[PDB]
Subunit: 243 residues, 6 copies
């Protein structure tokens, strides 16, 4: 009761004896339960606020799965506390809204780099510092994805703090013209804070919004997005077990 | 199944028929369950990611209780979708870390104004726009609090995107000298975005960190913080049922 | 001659033995003469540049009346020197140009908060710090105004350094859409610098420009504006004598 | 009564039939009365708030003398309205605080350029735009000053919105090291806004503060500053009558 | 004479018939002459200001070699005009000053990402946009370098506009603590502008300054730097001929 | 060989025994060869990258001529190293693109002031610091130019880091309306860094682009630009030999 408040990190509620060097983070707590279905020797570590934390084993490698909620500030809390617990490699398995016409629902966006349009990373360092993915991780992600059939795109995503501003339309058109593939709320914060803490970082995003329907299409789309999530999780697991 | 995706807001997962004009928001999903214990005719509306949404009745007035997770971006999603559902008055019942020496754990900080050091509100409008609480709400909060015994402080809080930067020490000392009472991650975003959407807004914060112990003190402190949370919730409920 | 340069503040030209804790500031030197007509035991304290300084008594309370000229920099000089002389409560009785259609000439705008679009407050502190009015003062201002017949509006004003830029039209439309009630040159500087110096602060503004005429209307409008000024001064005096 | 509000500029309260193309501006209203003592055919044009406006004749040339109060915002109002009245050449006769050790009281600083650390000019144009004095005017100012005995310095001044910030000490040392000669509140705004409105502009500043005393020295210093003011006014008058 | 001004790009002085899709850029004109010594079928294309442009063949692939002078603005001119001439892959072979202790002269820094502390890229796009190297190119650079003996480092470099500011010491220590490997003047501009123009981009830097000597050591150091340059050029050539 | 690396500045490759107090800088290395044709006792000092450095004598005065390449960063390197070598007066003889309709090719723009829209000067000091030309130098430049027939214009130029951005059209129209005479890449950096290093600075620009043709006109235009360059060089030489 008291020894836990002493030993555990205050938000993710785990310690260095529990956290693997290899970690997958995702925004949605329920996604953690889905991801561990792909793994053996699964155990619940902690549940606190938006932070749901499990360990599992994939091809002999222990990997920690951690939800972080929506947005840079909740991601950054997780990244810092995971680092304190001995994390060394962190892959985000997330969702994105497409910023280019021909990206279908359930297709994947692999963030090589990210526009730092969220405030969280800016608390740490000038915006001029690059948010980009680790080469070692991208190499394995590429090797895995090129050997299957679902379409995927490597490039730049935009991370931001709100899609509900009255300028959303203007922003979407501007960023589309700059060749941004998709938008999320967290990738740039993982890339910036993680790199500064010496972590290897990457981000694999399931497309869940078209750039721009009946019950049948609705069901088909849901299945496509579920398939994309599964592919993203598998790609991350395959990448991390090879480290 | 399909009609819900049509009718419900995509994150808080409720509609205009469900949401009261009067709303309490909090960061912690489990706090919603604690708050509704103070209310009658309670019903679960939605549970999605960090958004846990209930209705209850307090002295004849229906009030919606909504968790929002940690950080401005998740708060802003909630504020926007609540507005779309017909919210008119929103009070944050939250936690803060004290920025002045003599603020004890479980004492309350009522945010008259907030430093906009989070990125979320900046997506909407120049930082020069004031984050401040609605007079109508502050009047009722003051009237209630002055008639009880727990210490409370009206003034400025700082809202930010990270307490884990290497400059945290420098920031704390700077802001202490400027007379800031406490820090959180969300108040300024509620105040800025809410006011811009025409909402009456306020924020009542339970102090959960001293500016600067045995098992006994640990238990005493936990009780004090629980008492402070309860007081904050009651103050918000008393304020909203009088609108 | 020499002892005065030693004892008096260098711009307002008064000392701590002269200044009341309770102060009204206004931009126009001649307005001071008009305000003291409402007061007893009136005495001229100092006249220097745009700073015209008088004491008077209103319902048994001594209150200092001080002009400050146009603009944040001249206001800030006054605020700092008044603070040094022992001021504790300062109310601005000023003029504004309306930023909403239905605000008539001589109606009052009570600034709950202010957009810090002037440079003066920015010299002191990041623009993210809120410019807002003190609750204690707003409560008394509201109580007084609700008991009379002239229309008044509580909300946000914009303070700025120039209404003569070629973008004035664009600014007016932008700020109108954001729900700003009116514009002046000084309120945000009083609110920011005053709060930082530990002063209770408020601002009551007479509307002197429509958002958007014969000799008869011209005379009627002048009378309306004079009536509004008188009401603003009375409201400030009633508020301060009750402290 | 009504025709005046139609014809006169709203702050300086004069029209195009009254204002000379050649104008001296100063902060202090009482300085206008002192300056016109050096001139013939003097007439009071207007008195409104901090704006005291006179015409006089110096060596056959009619020149308008206009006070502007303290600070960029009140200066800018004057510059804009003078421009509207047909001003073409404007010289500031002002005061400065020295930022270098060996500048004595009553010695003159001629601003070749100015640091735009005031908000007023920033309302008009990016800070990257240069605040500098007109060559035609500097040539005549130099020609006049080199032919007399009081020490004077050509170079950069800093214009700002407050000398009362808690960082004043840090600012003074920083700017001293950058070779700034002196500080005022208005020069950069005249230079920036005036140049943008197509005016020839210059600024001659009487030093009134040492960078860093008995009744005797106090009197001697006052005389020195009065002599410096007189020299500055004469230099401006000699320059403008030669245009 | 006249047809050339019509057909050739105005600074690099070549056209689309001359430029290969595959290009090496370097700052030093004389480095171009050294690089082409490694190539067959070499021809001088143009010589204009700091832009010295040659074609050569390396393992059957035609590659253009182009000097760009020092600094982002001259680099950006080259990138834009090369793009207009049909460039698709551009590798910078440059020099850097080390920002970490154990990087020896003539060891290589491969820029995965770059801090955009130069103004050139900022003319195009918000600093929040990432300056990073293309995965396809990094994969080949890594594959080549891991198969030889000279030490090399993948990571972040800082690109800037001056190493001669009085804050150079403070900057070096700050950036060293952030884990930056080395500094140059151009990499971030190539990465930002090149990516925006749809180019594949990379940067291989020869270390020419220790983070922190007799005639013998001087000669040894010069040889080491020459060997490093040669290695960098070979790596770029090997990478591009495989595209 | 080794003593040179010890004694010479690392980019301009000259020392204090070689550099005159009086210096002309230009962007184009080949322009140095053209300028020295106007001079006696000419000697090549150094050739390194874009830096071509010669001494010559003009009417008994030794003057150093130094090319600097394109852009602020390469200019700033030259300014700093020239200062270290004992330079005291530096005049830029450069090219500009006209920003006003009636400025013909080969007419001269004398920069009184410059918009600091390049990053190089910003590395040194806040953009609010003025980039302007030295009075002593402008006086002599004016005296010389008024006594000949080629049209010339004194006023503001804009210095920037790229003319190839997609906003070039918008920028040109904006700056044209603000009365900017012409644009280059270096003037503001010379003015800012040079003034901070205590140098007397000026800039004389040959117009080489109309704001907005057959072989005959092409040849006529080339001659006009050559004549303008010659005039600019002569003006600089006449100015410096009189110091
Ligand atoms: O359990 C599955 O095989 C599965 C099937 C469908 C969707 C899934 C999504 C995940 O994130 C993980 C696993 C799945
Ligand atoms: O259920 C309670 O009475 C209670 C008791 C203790 C702590 C509480 C905190 C809340 O937010 C709400 C209610 C309580
Ligand atoms: O003297 C008055 O009663 C009066 C009458 C009319 C306008 C006034 C304006 C003031 O600011 C103060 C007083 C008045
Ligand atoms: O009236 C004077 O001769 C005089 C004498 C002394 C100081 C002065 C200052 C001024 O600005 C103008 C004139 C004077
Ligand atoms: O010519 C060489 O083999 C050589 C030898 C030494 C250094 C070199 C540097 C280069 O950039 C290219 C080639 C070399
Ligand atoms: O050599 C010349 O007389 C000459 C003739 C034509 C153009 C010139 C340009 C220069 O920069 C310098 C000299 C000239």
């Amino acid at each position: 009761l008291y020894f836990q408040s002493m030993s555990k990190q205050p938000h993710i509620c785990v310690d260095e004896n529990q956290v693997s060097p290899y970690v997958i983070v995702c925004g949605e707590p329920d996604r953690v339960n889905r991801i561990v279905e792909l793994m053996d020797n699964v155990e619940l570590l902690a549940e606190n606020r938006e932070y749901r934390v499990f360990n599992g084993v994939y091809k002999g490698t222990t990997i920690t799965i951690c939800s972080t909620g929506i947005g840079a500030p909740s991601m950054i809390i997780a990244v810092e506390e995971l680092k304190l617990c001995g994390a060394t490699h962190v892959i985000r398995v997330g969702s994105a809204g497409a910023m280019q016409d021909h990206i279908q629902l359930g297709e994947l966006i692999v963030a090589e780099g990210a526009v730092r349009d969220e405030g969280g990373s800016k608390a740490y360092i000038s915006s001029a510092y690059p948010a980009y993915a680790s080469f070692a991780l991208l190499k394995e992600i590429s090797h895995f994805l090129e050997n299957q059939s679902v379409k995927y795109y490597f490039g730049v995503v935009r991370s931001h703090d709100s899609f509900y501003t009255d300028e959303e339309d203007q922003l979407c058109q501007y960023w589309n013209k700059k060749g941004i593939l998709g938008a999320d709320m967290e990738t740039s914060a993982l890339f910036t804070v993680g790199r500064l803490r010496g972590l290897q970082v990457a981000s694999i995003l399931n497309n869940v919004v078209l750039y721009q329907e009946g019950v049948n299409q609705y069901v088909n789309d849901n299945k496509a997005m579920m398939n994309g999530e599964r592919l993203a999780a598998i790609t991350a697991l395959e990448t991390l077990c090879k480290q």
